[PDB]
Structure formats: structure tokens, C-alpha cells
Design a protein around this ligand. Sequence first.
Ligand SMILES: CO[C@@H]1C[C@H](C[C@@H](C)[C@@H]2CC(=O)[C@H](C)/C=C(\C)[C@@H](O)[C@@H](OC)C(=O)[C@H](C)C[C@H](C)/C=C/C=C/C=C(\C)[C@H](c3ccc(C)s3)C[C@@H]3CC[C@@H](C)[C@@](O)(O3)C(=O)C(=O)N3CCCC[C@H]3C(=O)O2)CC[C@H]1O
Lengths: 94, 107
Amino acid sequence: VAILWHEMWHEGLEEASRLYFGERNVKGMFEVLEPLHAMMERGPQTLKETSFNQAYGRDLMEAQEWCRKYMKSGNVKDLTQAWDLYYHVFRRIS
Amino acid sequence: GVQVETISPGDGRTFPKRGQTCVVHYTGMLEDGKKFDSSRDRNKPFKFMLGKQEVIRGWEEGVAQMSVGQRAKLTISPDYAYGATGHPGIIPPHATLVFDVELLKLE
Ligand SMILES: CO[C@@H]1C[C@H](C[C@@H](C)[C@@H]2CC(=O)[C@H](C)/C=C(\C)[C@@H](O)[C@@H](OC)C(=O)[C@H](C)C[C@H](C)/C=C/C=C/C=C(\C)[C@H](c3ccc(C)s3)C[C@@H]3CC[C@@H](C)[C@@](O)(O3)C(=O)C(=O)N3CCCC[C@H]3C(=O)O2)CC[C@H]1O
């Protein structure tokens, strides 16, 4: 499996937003987003991975802090804040 | 489903066309005026594409009818918004929404 980080995030955000906004399935939205973040955590290993991490790494790390805020708070406004940063990434990738 | 009332007129002749992106500013309120969201609070316009069910059906039918520069009040019944379920923590069940939206530009 060879896939650019640009692609895996565009598809992953699209799918996670469908589960969450369309299906009201928050468990399924996490299930999708956790492995994407865990790959950023491991670090870029190609030039194309590195430039994607340079442009979007900080926003995606901030979207993850909001999601983690929500885990502990139970307040859906913390998860919306994460979707504003995810959508800005998604639009930039698009 | 959606009632559209003009706040500030638009040109009357540039309407959104298939595959354009709409760039708007909006403020969303429940029926009694309680604000739940505003792009203007972020001072960052909201962009989306019509006709692809990206947004609730009130905006899809509402904003399609607007011309560039128009600002309008969209009053959207629950069936054209978030329905019996709402969006838990933000939009109650069976909620009529009122959005103030301004169509800034098409790109
Ligand atoms: C999957 O079904 C679709 C679900 C969609 C859900 C409502 C909430 C839309 C959300 C959007 O407009 C975003 C841009 C579109 C989607 C999530 C979907 O179309 C999705 O479908 C697969 C998709 O294509 C997008 C582009 C993928 C991308 C990775 C995700 C972007 C998510 C963006 C979320 C944003 C901008 C919103 C934020 C605002 C401020 C923040 C901070 S975050 C979400 C919050 C959630 C809570 C509600 C009260 C609200 O405040 O919007 C709100 O003010 C609202 O009702 N909006 C946003 C403004 C347009 C009208 C309306 C709506 O239609 O939202 C409705 C139409 C259904 O067909």
C-alpha cells in the first residue's frame, strides 16, 4: 500500500465527516481519524510527506487537540472546532 | 420548507451556477434568536458548492435563489434542517433555524 498523505487525508476527512454529520456516528468518525493522526505522529519519510506535514501538520495537530478536548469535556462545540480546522485542510488539499 | 426574505438587495441577475463555489457570510440562530454559529465571528467567509447535498436543504434551495451581493434571512423548517434528531449539543430536535446570509462572490 502506497498512497500519498494528501490522498489519505482527503479521503479520510470526507469519510469521517460523513459518519459524523450524515450518520451521527461519532465512534465511526474517531475510528477513521485515529490512524490518520497516528501516521503523522510517526513522522514524514518522503519529501512529499515532509512538505504535506510542513503545510498541514500544525492544523491537523490542533484539530486533534480539539477532538481530545471533546473526549474529556463531552461538549460538541469542541468537536465542531476540530471540524473547522479539518475542513480548512480539506479545502486546501482540494 | 424555506422562507427567504431580503435584508439587502443583490444585483438581481448573478445567481449561483452549477459547480460554482458560493462565498458567504452567515449567522445561524435558533427561532428565538439564540445564536449558535457565525462565520462573521471568525471574520472568515464560508465557502461551499451548491447542488451536491453539501449543505442542509434550506441552504441548497435558499442560497440558489440569491444573487451576488444579496443578504437575506432564511427561515428553515426542521424538515429542511436537522429534523427530529437535530445536532445533539447544538441544534435541538425539530428546530426551525434562522440564518442571516450574505452571498459575497461566486468563484
Ligand atoms: C453528509 O451529509 C451532509 C451533512 C451536512 C452537515 C451540515 C452540518 C453542514 C456541514 C457543512 O456545511 C460542511 C462544509 C459539509 C459537510 C460536513 C458535508 O457535505 C460533507 O459530506 C460528505 C463534505 O462534503 C465536506 C466538504 C467534507 C469536509 C471534510 C468537512 C467539513 C465540515 C465542515 C463543518 C463546518 C463548516 C461547520 C462548522 C461551523 C463552524 C465550526 C467551527 S465548524 C459544521 C457546524 C456543525 C453544527 C451546525 C449548527 C453548524 O454550525 O455547522 C451550522 O452553522 C450549519 O448548520 N451549517 C454550516 C453552514 C451551512 C449550513 C449548515 C450546514 O449545512 O452544515 C449537511 C448536508 C448533508 O447532505
